[PDB]
Design a protein around this nucleic acid. Structure first.
Ligand SMILES: Nc1ncnc2c1ncn2[C@@H]1O[C@H](COP(=O)(O)OP(=O)(O)O)[C@@H](O)[C@H]1O
Ligand SMILES: Nc1ncnc2c1ncn2[C@@H]1O[C@H](COP(=O)(O)OP(=O)(O)O)[C@@H](O)[C@H]1O
Ligand SMILES: [Mg+2]
Ligand SMILES: [Mg+2]
Ligand SMILES: [Mn+2]
Ligand SMILES: [Mn+2]
Lengths: 374, 381, 368, 374
DNA sequence: AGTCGTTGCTGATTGGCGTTGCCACCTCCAGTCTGGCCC
DNA sequence: GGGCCAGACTGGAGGTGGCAACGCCAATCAGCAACGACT
């Protein structure tokens, strides 16, 4: 997956209709591009449009629908977001739009109008919310729950994977590796044990024994037990990526039922430590490396060719930030296009390609450069 | 010639975990008997044959049994795809039904055809048009809005209707044949399809509406509606199937045929006393099958475990309860009249009185509730 | 009088990511063409018509199209339900199928039918017997059912000079199985003895995907699938049997080769060996991409070796479907092995291990 | 509650014993002091040591006890943290220490030894863990869950109060304002109703009706209902504080059962919207204002005069960071003393006094200025 | 022959896990209005 | 000047989900009482 063009209209502080087309002259090199501007200018809104057009959700707002829509700018009657992406050499277009009744800002919100269509063929593939979501999840390999963890790293949620519950971590691992048969086995074992127990109200004790081993509703126990091998396979790639980002640390799987990743401190005579004890910047780098590995775990099936992350660089000093940027530049050689949100002057000076989200004082609105207007 | 106009069978629909197999089978048998009695030439099913893209096994069994038992009558049959059933699911049986005096259309572009009478002579020009999915008739392009795309879709569907009717007229030529038309879309006589955009066909048998009605006062454009009640909002209404007759190449008349009710249903309102009073009417009746009820208890802050009460009331009755609900929605929060009041100043009794004042209860229970509340403060001291 | 014997079509089977629609279509049209050429009197399909109990949309379209095209030929046809086929999926359309010179049997106990010739005269007795569910009727129960059913057909035939044919979807002693062959009667029967078949003039059987003469007698045969349904049988040509009868006795049996349209190959050895074996398709320009199973003999990570495998394949007109190592990944190990690794950490008492293993296996089978 | 002295010994990257006194020649003006240094140097470790000394717990580590102690430095057999704080004009001392068996860099973690004492006369007031926690909670007025919301803002958890669920916001408010009786009322009502029900009467019906109004287990419902006045007072104070911190926004409570706050964008003609739409920097400023309002709310019952901000200053741009620092300077001109940790280069010049922390050539340890060495 | 350091043996808390209800999104409609024209 | 007709909607219910507050049970933690462990 890679993003070809982004078109948005009246989202947050970005009043008006804006079209950002990559593969143009400034973005032809697939190099580093950074979105710069004051706080509250709408930088995150650019990344919110990409997530909105694809998965009908944005990281800040759980859902946007008829009942509620806090994403469209005030004193405006409509909003829309549309993205062009390319999977396996074929381009597709996703579209999400909503209009207020009678074109008046006080009117009630109407149902969204969604589409998914090939760019060159022009044929429409889906026109409903559920159909579009399922088809785009199948096509890209990753739905929203995997996009937000392996392709877009939102503000303040870089450590979501490490800090997530073991249940959520195992569920994400199954989603990426397509191994739900273990969860189904555990769930039906629990269901059959419950049925036998109610029929009681020598098979019952054996069913209870099997339930205590692998049985659980929605398959928690056996999912967690089975996903250890996937966790080790992910940890290998995580170490490979982290060696370039931050040479001090290495990752090693916890020896406990709740699947977790310990860390090895090579400077401290290879003394192993829990992952909770890492610093803020070290945890950010560990999470970034782990997410890159997570996107490299399914490279053979559905490769991901872009990465977006949001102001995670604020926790790094001038040297660790430089090492991380050298690693990101080296990874940019593979052809993965990286987009960064930041305010650090050093990296803003380093990166030459910028999308300046200029702010208009007093009004509360904002605008891009004139070349992106439409 | 004579044809029937029906649609919205919704075969295989599950209605609150219930199955409509017996009702659908009875309706299909009655329709076969009616066709035999009235000597009909064709039957038109305007979409929503199946309630889903992958109907269960018994829905397919019912469809197969109908299409095989129709062979005795010798009358033709036309089945069209709706917004519910799947184009591929209906196209599965296209060629196999082509040998069984049946034609099914699911995709666009299917050319007009001539319906033969019972003796084989050309009777009418069918001009079949199924539910036109947007993915079939338009090509998406970048740089449009939510309303502009809908405008393009409406223009395209109107153009499709006009061109297909022109082709049907070309096929008809000079022979006096009534050009019937078909569709499965919403009309209002905006996203709906205006009725004035329809071609001047001799008859238009539409679908997508479960209630029989005439559109724009034009008797030659009608919605046949569902033959069975598919929800509690239409339980008491009678259902009709149109019997259409043509003469000398022009429409003659439309007759409504009542579909007998197989599974009775009813809906009740009011408090528990009113529910008991309305349930009294079923005290001693032999009901085959038991009647299905929707109960809407009007809220007076009874706040009881009403499921058990309904189960006890309807236990001895020949009654099965599918759904019961209530309108209990209300917000619960304090309004600060002035900033000078803080939670330390106000007493517990004062806060409780503020809580109760937001409820519209009366002194018949306010005194007892206040006494009960004071008992709690008594037992902590 | 001639009869084409085929079975185990497995319509709608998803081979990994790929689908078998094109192969099945190019088989069905060829089968119709050969039926017309040999002016066969009937075509019999003994079991596993559909890969599963809820076939996809295109599989049913292929089946209906084949039945429709049968009418232009004029041959009678018979369908039987296999171990993977389900009642209320073949039996739901039975009534419509009758009008098209086709009889479909899924439930046991069906009375024997007289199979007409192309001229309308009787040709044989069919004895339609599908895959017999144990609940519908054990080794003796299969035998006496076959004997009783044959006896009923014998009474029906009387003294007329016609052959008697029998059907079945079951495993037999001396057969060779494959990975794609799903087992049946896991807890009650192991194999049916070939000597217990009633003395019918010919037997048509399915279930096994490999053509085999069983028991040593000619009048009992496995016809096998018409297309390769697993990677362990790619190189073996597939057969359809054109049996012939005359004067109430078997005349001869002939094998017809189904022309292969989808090349499939299996690779072996180390990465160095595979880098040379892949050169079989360098600049050959096979218009149907070849499906490959790569049995790499390395200990390197699968998710790392697949990258270089794809890199090598990108310059070739080939498409890899499966890669297996001959550390471990979850996509490799079997469910039984993974569950046993849980049992090992628990106490290793066999007295409970056997019961737990049986319970886990039956749970997994109920999922499947 | 003002931190006078801080003593720690072998915590995280700070090997050896150190003491920082906030009454020496530096910090005499009670002004801004900026703990500065590279990533993973022990900056966060200082605040973690303060929190550990006060409440036997750390923002990162859920509990430090006879087991799972991972705050102690590697290859070290003992660690301790001691602080001196002043409440109501008199100073106290808190002490927490743990040592390994046989004073080896391995072995069993011995049960920690804690104490609380007055500096006026040296009398030991509590030595048990539970008694020390209860006594320090009664003395200060702040439990851990209120200290970490008002005085110490960890990195990434500044918006914890804003994003907390209604239950754990109402529970915080009732304990902060000393209005806990409403929770006990709901608990008693629910217990009475359950006891009446289990016997199975019109009295049961009345109990059920009363329970539907205010009754709930753990006292959630009536507490949430009653704390509306407290939330309104708090949002009033927060708005008054925020007028000078960020002039664009105001704050008000919404008409919902959940205790929630909405912003009123004064620039866009007072258009009111939920806080979920706030930018990162705007949400940081709103959370800082809410924390200051939390401090001001109980100023008439127990006064807290210290504030520590771990991170989140990066989310702000230069043109906003200067205004935020000016507002912080205005607040610091009062009795409150505040300390800020950041890596941004702008704050290097504005704050003249710094508790510099430096690592040592990759040895894995770190040391701060020798003037703080014991 | 005196002092201490370490280790089991008991109450409390408490946090995941399952349970029973209880709220958010689609797809077909009857109720609600509001302005213009002619007698 | 009033009654009738024609536009223009519209929120709303039967299915699907997710989550919220409980009740429960296994796990954990803080005091005690020995018990050993040194000079
Ligand atoms: N519905 C809305 N109407 C108008 N402005 C909005 C709306 N929702 C959010 N905003 C504002 O839009 C801006 C978006 O900025 P954002 O992209 O979050 O900035 P940053 O990149 O610094 O995090 C903020 O000022 C936010 O408050
Ligand atoms: N038990 C431990 N022993 C030694 N070092 C540790 C231990 N736990 C954490 N550390 C290290 O101590 C350092 C603490 O840095 P921290 O104060 O979090 O940095 P920052 O202020 O940049 O967030 C990190 O390098 C961390 O990995
Ligand atoms: Mg930190
Ligand atoms: Mg942001
Ligand atoms: Mn088989
Ligand atoms: Mn088979």
């Amino acid at each position: 997956m890679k993003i070809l063009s982004l078109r948005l209209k009246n989202l947050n502080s970005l009043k008006g209709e804006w079209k950002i087309d990559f593969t143009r002259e400034p973005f032809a090199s697939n190099g580093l591009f950074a979105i710069t501007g004051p706080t509250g200018a709408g930088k995150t809104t650019l990344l919110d449009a990409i997530c909105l057009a694809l998965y009908h959700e944005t990281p800040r707002l759980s859902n946007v629908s008829q009942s509620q829509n806090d994403l469209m700018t005030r004193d405006t009657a409509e909003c829309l977001a549309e993205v062009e992406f390319e999977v396996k050499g074929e381009a597709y277009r996703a579209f999400w739009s909503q209009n207020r009744a009678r074109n008046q800002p006080d009117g009630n919100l109407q149902v969204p109008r969604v589409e998914l269509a090939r760019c060159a063929d022009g044929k429409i593939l889906a026109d409903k919310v559920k159909d579009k979501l399922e088809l785009t999840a199948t096509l890209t390999g990753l739905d929203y729950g995997r996009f937000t963890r392996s392709m877009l790293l939102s503000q303040g949620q870089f450590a979501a994977f490490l800090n997530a519950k073991p249940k959520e971590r195992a569920e994400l691992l199954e989603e990426l590796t397509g191994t739900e048969i273990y969860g189904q086995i555990s769930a039906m074992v629990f269901e059959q044990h419950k049925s036998a127990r109610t029929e009681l109200e020598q098979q019952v004790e054996d069913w209870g024994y099997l339930n205590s081993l692998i049985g659980s509703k929605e398959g928690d126990k056996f999912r967690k037990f089975a996903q250890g091998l996937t966790l080790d396979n992910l940890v290998h790639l995580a170490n490979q990526q982290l060696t370039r980002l931050h040479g001090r640390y290495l990752l090693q799987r916890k020896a406990s039922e709740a699947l977790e990743v310990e860390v090895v401190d090579t400077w401290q005579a290879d003394a192993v430590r829990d992952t909770r004890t890492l610093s803020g910047g070290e945890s950010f780098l560990v999470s970034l490396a782990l997410a890159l590995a997570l996107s490299d775990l399914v490279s053979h099936k559905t490769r991901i060719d872009s990465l977006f992350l949001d102001e995670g660089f604020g926790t790094l000093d001038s040297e660790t930030l430089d090492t991380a940027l050298d690693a990101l530049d080296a990874l940019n050689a593979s052809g993965k296009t990286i987009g960064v949100i930041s305010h650090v002057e050093a990296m803003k000076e380093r990166i030459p390609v910028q999308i300046k989200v200029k702010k208009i004082n007093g009004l509360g609105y904002s605008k891009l450069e004139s070349t992106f207007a439409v | 010639m004579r044809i029937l106009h029906t649609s919205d069978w919704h075969l295989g629909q599950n209605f609150y975990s219930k199955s409509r197999e017996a009702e659908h089978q009875a309706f299909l048998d009655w329709l076969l008997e009616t066709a035999q009695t009235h000597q009909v030439d064709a039957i038109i099913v305007a979409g929503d044959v199946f309630d889903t893209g992958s109907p269960p096994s018994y829905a397919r069994t019912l469809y197969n049994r109908f299409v095989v038992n129709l062979q005795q009558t010798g009358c033709h049959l036309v089945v069209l795809a709706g917004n519910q059933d799947s184009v591929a699911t209906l196209n599965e049986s296209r060629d196999i039904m082509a040998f069984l005096n049946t034609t099914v259309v699911a995709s666009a572009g299917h050319a007009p055809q001539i319906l033969p009478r019972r003796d084989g002579t050309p009777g009418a020009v069918l001009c079949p048009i199924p539910f036109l999915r947007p993915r079939d008739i338009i090509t998406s392009q970048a740089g449009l809005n939510g309303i502009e795309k809908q405008q393009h879709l409406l223009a395209a569907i109107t153009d499709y209707y006009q061109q297909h009717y022109a082709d049907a007229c070309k096929l008809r030529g000079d022979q006096p044949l009534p050009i019937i038309a078909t569709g499965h879309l919403t009309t209002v006589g905006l996203d709906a399809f205006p009725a004035q955009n329809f071609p001047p066909a001799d008859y238009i048998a539409l679908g997508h509406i479960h209630r029989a009605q005439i559109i724009g006062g034009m008797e030659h454009v009608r919605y046949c509606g569902s033959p069975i009640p598919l929800s509690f909002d239409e339980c008491g209404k009678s259902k009709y199937v149109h019997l259409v007759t043509f003469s000398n190449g022009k429409l003659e008349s439309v007759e409504n045929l009542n579909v007998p009710v197989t599974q009775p249903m009813a809906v009740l309102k009011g408090d528990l006393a009113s529910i008991t009073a309305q349930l009294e009417q079923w005290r001693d009746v032999s009901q085959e099958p038991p009647v299905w009820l929707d109960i809407e208890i009007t809220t007076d802050e009874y706040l009881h475990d009403i499921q058990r009460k309904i189960q006890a009331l309807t236990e001895s009755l020949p009654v099965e309860v599918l759904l019961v609900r209530r309108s209990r929605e209300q917000r619960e929060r304090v309004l600060a009249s002035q900033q000078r009041e803080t939670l330390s100043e106000l007493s517990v009794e004062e806060v409780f009185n503020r809580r109760l004042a937001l409820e519209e209860l009366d002194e018949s229970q306010q005194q007892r509730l206040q006494h009960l509340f004071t008992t709690t403060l008594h037992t902590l001291a």
